[PDB]
Design a protein around this ligand. Structure first.
Ligand SMILES: Cc1cc2nc3c(=O)[nH]c(=O)nc-3n(C[C@H](O)[C@H](O)[C@H](O)COP(=O)(O)O)c2cc1C
Length: 116
């Protein structure tokens, strides 16, 4: 199965990407070397809804799963709608270890309804 995903380590400064799937490289047009150690916010740009970014920030703070649809940008500046799902990953002792973030590319929710 095709799997667009990244794993971050929230126990390192500003939650850097420590793994990015081949399909994530293909979707975003970035190389692995350009992604590893970055916060995944680099995909955001002018058209990204800051209210949606806020919902992600709160979900990371509270270590809760969330799904949002937001505008992201490829390396070459191509806009794409990202249906983005965040999942906290805890160790055997219930301590946060990682976040996994899975991307689906497409305007799943029409922008007229998303804007409501
Ligand atoms: C595992 C993981 C994957 C993420 N993937 C994306 C993504 O694909 N697109 C995006 O805009 N933000 C993504 N983020 C969110 C940003 O990294 C950041 O948490 C968000 O923009 C809110 O924080 P900020 O307000 O400090 O930027 C991801 C976060 C995590 C932990």
């Amino acid at each position: 199965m095709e799997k667009n995903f990244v794993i971050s380590d929230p126990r390192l400064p500003d939650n850097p990407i420590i793994f990015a799937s081949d399909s994530f490289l293909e979707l975003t047009e970035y190389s692995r070397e350009e992604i590893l150690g970055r916060n995944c916010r680099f995909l955001q740009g002018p058209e990204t809804d800051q209210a949606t970014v806020q919902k992600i920030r709160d979900a990371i703070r509270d270590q809760r799963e969330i799904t949002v649809q937001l505008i992201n940008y490829t390396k070459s500046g191509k806009k794409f709608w990202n249906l983005f799902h965040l999942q906290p990953m805890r160790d055997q002792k219930g301590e946060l270890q990682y976040f996994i973030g899975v991307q689906l590319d497409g305007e799943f929710i029409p922008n007229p309804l998303l804007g409501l």
